[PDB]
Amino acid sequence: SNEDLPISMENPYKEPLKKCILCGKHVDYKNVQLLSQFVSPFTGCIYGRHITGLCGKKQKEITKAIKRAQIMGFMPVTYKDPAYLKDPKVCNIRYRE
Amino acid sequence: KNVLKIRRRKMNHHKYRKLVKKT
Amino acid sequence: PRYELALILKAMQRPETAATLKRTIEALMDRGAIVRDLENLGERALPYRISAHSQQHNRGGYFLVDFYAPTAAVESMVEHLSRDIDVIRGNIVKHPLTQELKECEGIVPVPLAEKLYS
Amino acid sequence: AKHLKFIARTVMVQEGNVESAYRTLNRILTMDGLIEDIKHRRYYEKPCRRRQRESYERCRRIYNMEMARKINFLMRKNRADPWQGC
Amino acid sequence: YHEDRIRAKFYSVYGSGQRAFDLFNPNFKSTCQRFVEKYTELQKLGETDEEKLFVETGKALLAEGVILRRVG
Amino acid sequence: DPPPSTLLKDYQNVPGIEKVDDVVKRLLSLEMANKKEMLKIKQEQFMKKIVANPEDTRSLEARIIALSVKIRSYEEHLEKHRKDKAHKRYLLMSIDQRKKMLKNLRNTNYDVFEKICWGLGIEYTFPP
Amino acid sequence: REVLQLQEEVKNFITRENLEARVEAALDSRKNYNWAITREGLVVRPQR
Amino acid sequence: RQFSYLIENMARDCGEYAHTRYFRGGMLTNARLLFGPTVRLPDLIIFLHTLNNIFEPHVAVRDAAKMNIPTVGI
Amino acid sequence: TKFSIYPPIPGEESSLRWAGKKFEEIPIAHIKASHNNTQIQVVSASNEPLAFASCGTEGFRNAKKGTGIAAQTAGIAAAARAKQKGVIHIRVVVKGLGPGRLSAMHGLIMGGLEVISITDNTPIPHXGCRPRKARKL
Amino acid sequence: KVWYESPSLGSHSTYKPSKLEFLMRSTSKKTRKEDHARLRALNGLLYKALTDLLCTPEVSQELYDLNVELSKVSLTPDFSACRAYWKTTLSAEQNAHMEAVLQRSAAHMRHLLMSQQTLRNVPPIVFVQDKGNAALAELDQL
RNA sequence: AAACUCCAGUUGACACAAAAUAGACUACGAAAGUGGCUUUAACAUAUCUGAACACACAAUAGCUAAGACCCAAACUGGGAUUAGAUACCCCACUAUGCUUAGCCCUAAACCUCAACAGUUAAAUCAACAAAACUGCUCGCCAGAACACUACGAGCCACAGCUUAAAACUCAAA
């Protein structure tokens, strides 16, 4: 018929879907350094996904990892271990003065 | 909706339970 | 199946720490376990004070034992660890490396209408 | 009780300014939800009541975020009238 | 269009040209369009591989004086 | 039950499994696996014993054998968990579903219905 | 392939004969499972 | 309103009529009252834009159909 | 060096000092700010009591105990008895959201004590005892 | 939508809160129930914008050290000024220093709100001390 | 006000009670329910529909027996309020909430939406709720009130549950 007519196919310019900082990485309860990045420095409270930026799957793994590490003797509950206060700040929360 | 039908049933059941209690 | 024993031992000198590990690995073998590896995570301060066997602990030796055992061995091993006075806290979990992580394309957007609707 | 002390919920005072240190501590406890948690725990909230308020709070937050997004989007045209007189 | 596949790869590999689109000129040709036309010419010469047909096209334009700065 | 030394259904037909170290044989046996792996061996044992084509899993016979293995697992579960109402429901539902299968197999293929009853030890009962 | 890989690993598995050697060989070593993530998704291994 | 001035001039040039302003309720359906009993309404209404400034249909589209006036519209 | 709101960690080597004393050696002012009272106890780093004052021990009674000015007065009283024992710098540990939570700290300062840190230790159970039923008002 | 109604017929209409619109607005017009919601939401954004500017060190090192906290922020519906209530500290002298720093900063703050162009058309920002502790300051001085 | 004053504060030891944050998530389960950790077992059906009663379950409250008991808490007692206060407010304490073994079988047990399959074109549609419908099957309904009642029958239920009328009365509900 006509060569210039549109052709059916999938979007070639489509961009990849977004990925969380932990997409594709194993979350172990023994890696307290990683887990400590998602708890409050002052209170030890686990941050919600709106603060951590994690997806539902990794938000769940982090939560389950923290709870396991805390009661198994690897991670404190009421505060962030001070050793990990100088690690990269990956959470969208501003606290001090 | 209003609870006027429930209120009729409520009083009927209260008075029945009280009647059974007395006798 | 394949399990991982997270073992926190009483802070002791090298001879008594080795005797505790040997006594603990033999208990696994006596129950039919095939021990794969033993890892030392180092002695550290506990995240909180732990009372075990009429003693208070602030430091402990963290060790891992990767092993295979029948499903009935877990219950019997947990009981053995509860009676060893040199073990502060011992937990047996399914080895994390057995569970294979499923691939993720990314974060699909969720319609806000569903949020309030749900 | 079994944890180390003077780490959790601890703020240092700078240059003797205790008012600013107290405001920082109160801001920390507020953002982490401890202040609201303490208050809701003075009397027992019954499970049906907790679910109702949690459901009300989640729907109000969504409605406010969606109403903020709409105004931000519709404020782009708040510029001066380009066709005044027409 | 079939050429959209070539445009997606060109933008990924080389990015958008520092040259500015002039959508007022109805006969404007961008660096990507110049790349697509050469890519189409070489395909008609019998070459059928995709990864090979893309590398030869970049060389041809460099010979013609075109600036192709790879993004990464 | 199959012996604990029995190899897993996946590793039984790999070439050279009989010449590996004893430790490797223990790690590929039922002893080192969960109970669900023992049930896959039981199902395959009944399939070869009863059905004409042991690889046809969509036939009414294979479904009766597969469900009969699940039913036996629930019975063993409930022998140790007598207040588990969730699995008691699953058992009673599974028995009802098998009876429906047996009813449909009896009506369509009686010779196969008889072999399923003999092989699995099922005494078919007509409903009241 | 899984039986072959597993057959080599069994050579390094702990046994009653080599138990003492592996127990002592562990007290001298250290295994670190800690690492941190960045906003760009990059792992930051510990300084050791 | 970007084109109000352009459209008003085009109407004057061709000898026709333009309504680019706020459309008051009943210009067509109540014309005799607003203009007089002998007012002649348009025989053709040409919409260069069929939507009003709240992205709804221009009221004159519905009212032109009510008055049996043919409409041309972009 | 820039100021850190995070307290110095014990066992590490900090340069901060108060009258030649390390953070671990500074006495502690324990403020219990209840809804109907405020209690202040100053103790040494070794848990030796040095001063105690509450709104009740300062002559306040009934609803007057549950006021800021009553807590401020209790702080001044505890500060005076603590200053006599050699206390200048104190670490404040306040538990409770009562009206004397902040006022009790002001009284400690007006009494001659210098607060170097503030710690909240308000008890929050993580799941714990059931509180009393809601009030109908 | 939610139990809170959001079916507005003129939903797409461009919200234009400017001082000039009020003078051309019809006072005869009666505000809709949802007309307040648009104003209430804008006030929430102005609160978040000022509150965030306050806690960032760079904007003004004087401002950050003060650790100012805003009690409430209600823009005037007239659009003349953006009221910005700031909680008053108990220290009597500190309420003057904080107030003085705020007044000087306020002039620069308005330009910095134009950096966030969505909030560009912001009226002159006005800071109000919370009389709860401030009113008592005047009396105790006398 | 009463109450306590072997009381309170700090520190240490310390549960058969309850499970911050995560959770702004919306998952699991037939429903009821299920949100600390670990492990074991484990989540029926290769066409659907199919029971007041068969089969198996079923929050809270409650019963029988033996235990635990921090805290909460009907009832009860005391304080106060009030014209009265068998309430609302304060304090104390019990049954009870927990465990074990049996019962009991109810709920605004409610997305107030029966199961399955299909459609988005017709008229979009009484109203509101939750856009409007088709096929097919089971269950159920036929003015109000009498009536979650009477009688009968069944039931570990005995002041109970399930099923469930009639007479008199009204022109509404």
Ligand code: FES
């Ligand atoms: S986006 Fe892939 S795991 Fe989070």
Ligand SMILES: [K+]
């Ligand atoms: K919990």
Ligand SMILES: [K+]
């Ligand atoms: K409901």
Ligand SMILES: [Mg+2]
């Ligand atoms: Mg009645």
Ligand SMILES: [Mg+2]
């Ligand atoms: Mg059915």
Ligand SMILES: [Mg+2]
């Ligand atoms: Mg039924």
Ligand SMILES: [Mg+2]
């Ligand atoms: Mg029936």
Ligand SMILES: [Mg+2]
């Ligand atoms: Mg019933």
Ligand SMILES: [Mg+2]
């Ligand atoms: Mg029940």
Ligand SMILES: [Mg+2]
């Ligand atoms: Mg009970």
Ligand SMILES: [Mg+2]
């Ligand atoms: Mg009590």
Ligand SMILES: [Mg+2]
């Ligand atoms: Mg009384």
Ligand SMILES: [Mg+2]
């Ligand atoms: Mg009791």
Ligand SMILES: [Mg+2]
């Ligand atoms: Mg319990």
Ligand SMILES: [Mg+2]
């Ligand atoms: Mg319910």
Ligand SMILES: [Mg+2]
């Ligand atoms: Mg049905």
